[PDB]
């Protein structure tokens, strides 16, 4: 009964780990000798956006590299303007605790989600001026951690009750539900083609999903502690995870192995947020050692320090055009960088 | 480029309207005190929050005491894991920690003591004070009369404990129950003092979950926390 199933599971695990060991031929560092270092990237704050009361726990860029939304745990949701540091909307929330936001790709909708277990959708059409909550999406029993828009009419949400949904804003009902994790899902990033989305969970495991069928395709177990942040490579065929074990790691969706890991001796603290750039050469990585950081996807070596904050950095989003690099700390302050 | 000056002025009008909308909520956010209510489920936690009153993840609770506003964020339908959604509770004024002194299927004081140990040493909670409520103190009166009770075996260090002289128990009870009661407070104070950080302090209290003085105790300890926090940046403490 239970013993036979456990033996079958452990034999399958042995086979899987042996197959993964078979895929390994050489380390990524060896074949990257010709890759020159990017050098010391002296980055300086171009603009700084005062206006948030309490810590910013998440923020998103618009699809035109101009407007950015920034969630705060003070009960606000500010829609900035990176060009002129102007506030074009300051829409409040009915739940004080906000753990994630999202800016719709069309630039017409916004989302939010936190401990209230409801993923409010804000409509910026404004046929009457004042924004409205177009739909509240309920059905989760844990707590929302990251919601991103597939398109104008499909929003995927991650919850802490080991469940990823995929809603439908037209009708407000789960099209499909993704189960199979063990702990707390807390970060997912959609693909550049918006076909699949990864999902890291606090059990130190990532699981590529799919939005058509609804079944996990590949899984990854490389981290030794709860995962914190995750994204995609600009090509969409790789993704870097960062977990609270003071390590960063990189994956591939077809190699199924830790292609190249990043670490150093002096780091003894975890990582809070992660993002790439569009050339796939600058892994920007917001650490909890009171400063952001940058690494190289092909060098695994230091390239710059974005030290301007006074607490952790919980959000770090490079812009779509690649022109600027926002950042936001628990110091309730938001900065914009542009290397010059 | 004369078609942009009007739009720039309109955007400035929107920006100044928004800053006006935010500077008024400045004071609203800085006025209230955020209190995180926490503890084991099998305690009188729900009774405490119901007294404070007189599906969602977080149950709000607003109340005024001496014309200061308290937001009490009782945790609602959530999972047992606390490692993650506690990290966002670091701006709270204090963490009310309601623990039941039920020394019985499984021991509650050791699990709650371990949970307080995890709360105390957390990296982001090194600056948030904790307010201890030792509930069900009256139950110890009826629990110590069983003879070979659960108070002397699961904690053999109580077998040779001498009650402090400076501690004056509630009059009307035998010294034995006072000993068995102050023992738990000593168990908690051992860790609450052994950390030595000095940036955050505990506050032990005894309550029976049915009285008006719970809210008064919360308000007094919050005022004390605020006073010590103000003294902190003056290097007076």
């Amino acid at each position: 009964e239970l013993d036979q199933l456990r033996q079958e599971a452990e034999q399958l695990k042995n086979q899987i780990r042996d197959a993964r060991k078979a895929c390994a031929d050489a380390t990524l560092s060896q074949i990257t000798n010709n890759i020159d270092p990017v050098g010391r990237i002296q980055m300086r704050t171009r603009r700084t956006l005062r206006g948030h009361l309490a810590k910013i726990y998440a923020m998103h860029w618009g699809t035109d590299s101009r407007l950015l939304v920034s969630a705060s745990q003070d009960g606000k949701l500010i829609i900035w303007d990176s060009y002129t540091t102007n506030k074009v909307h300051a829409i409040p929330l009915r739940s004080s605790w906000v753990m994630t936001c999202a800016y719709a790709p069309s630039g017409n909708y916004v989302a939010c989600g936190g401990l209230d277990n409801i993923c409010s959708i804000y409509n910026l059409k404004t046929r009457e001026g004042n924004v409205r909550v177009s739909r509240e999406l309920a059905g989760h029993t844990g707590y929302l951690s990251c919601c991103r828009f597939l398109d104008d009419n499909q929003i995927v949400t991650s919850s802490g009750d080991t469940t990823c949904a995929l809603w439908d804003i037209e009708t407000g009902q789960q099209t499909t539900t993704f189960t199979g994790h063990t702990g707390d899902v807390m970060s997912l990033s959609l693909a550049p083609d918006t076909r699949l989305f990864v999902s890291g969970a606090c059990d130190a495991s990532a699981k590529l999903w799919d939005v058509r069928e609804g079944m996990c395709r590949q899984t990854f177990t490389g981290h030794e502690s709860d995962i914190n942040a995750i994204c995609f490579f600009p090509n969409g065929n790789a993704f870097a995870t960062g977990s609270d074990d003071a390590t960063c790691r990189l994956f591939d969706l077809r190699a199924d192995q830790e292609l190249m890991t990043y670490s150093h001796d002096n780091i003894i603290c975890g990582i809070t947020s992660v993002s790439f750039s569009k050339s796939g050469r600058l892994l920007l990585a917001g650490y909890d050692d009171f400063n952001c950081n940058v690494w190289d996807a092909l060098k695994a070596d230091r390239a710059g320090v974005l030290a301007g904050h006074d607490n952790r950095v919980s959000c770090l989003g490079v812009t779509d055009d690649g022109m600027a690099v926002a950042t936001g700390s628990w110091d309730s302050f938001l900065k914009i960088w542009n290397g010059s | 480029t004369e078609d942009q000056r009007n739009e720039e002025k309109a955007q400035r009008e929107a920006n100044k309207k928004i800053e006006k909308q935010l500077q008024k909520d400045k004071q609203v956010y800085r006025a209230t005190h955020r209190l995180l209510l926490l503890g084991a489920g099998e305690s009188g936690k729900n009774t405490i929050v119901k007294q404070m009153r007189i599906t969602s993840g977080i149950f709000e609770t607003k109340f005024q005491v001496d014309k200061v506003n308290f937001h009490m964020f009782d945790v609602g339908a959530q999972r047992d894991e606390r490692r993650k959604w506690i990290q966002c509770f670091n701006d709270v004024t204090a963490i009310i920690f309601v623990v039941a002194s039920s020394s019985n299927q499984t021991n509650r004081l050791q699990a709650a003591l371990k949970l307080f140990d995890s709360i105390w040493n957390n990296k982001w909670l090194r600056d948030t004070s904790v307010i201890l409520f030792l509930n069900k103190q009256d139950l110890l009166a009826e629990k110590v009369l069983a003879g070979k009770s659960k108070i002397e075996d699961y904690f053999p260090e109580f077998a040779r404990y001498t009650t402090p002289e400076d501690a004056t128990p509630e009059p009307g009870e035998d010294p034995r129950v006072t000993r068995a009661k102050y023992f738990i407070r000593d168990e908690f104070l051992r860790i609450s003092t052994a950390s030595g950080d000095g940036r955050h302090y505990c506050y032990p209290h005894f309550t029976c979950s049915v009285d008006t003085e719970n809210i008064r105790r919360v308000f007094n300890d919050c005022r004390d926390i605020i006073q010590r926090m103000h003294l902190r940046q003056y290097e007076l403490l």
Partner: nanobody
Amino acid sequence: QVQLQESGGGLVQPGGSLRLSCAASGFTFSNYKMNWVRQAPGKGLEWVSDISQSGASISYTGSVKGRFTISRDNAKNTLYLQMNSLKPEDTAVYYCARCPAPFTRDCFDVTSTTYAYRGQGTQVTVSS
């Protein structure tokens, strides 16, 4: 993948002797504190005894102190819990629990059904 394995056990008379050994792989053993969590039949998960990175601080549940002792040895990459001087009221499944947070003495989840970094444990039965 983080894994834990446990051994030991077997029928022992009350007041006898026993030892429980914990094997870990997939992570560095020095960083994390390690403790023992035993579940008695039909009961919730109970906590027994913990050892920190080196072994400077060792603590016990009162019902277990005076008879059991713990040991940690980073070089052997294993954890020890000596289990002599038995009582007929502690027959249980043992889980060599790991705390997830490295380089710190504060971590929450240890005693829960939904925790991930715990082993299948070993059954320890004590009877006449």
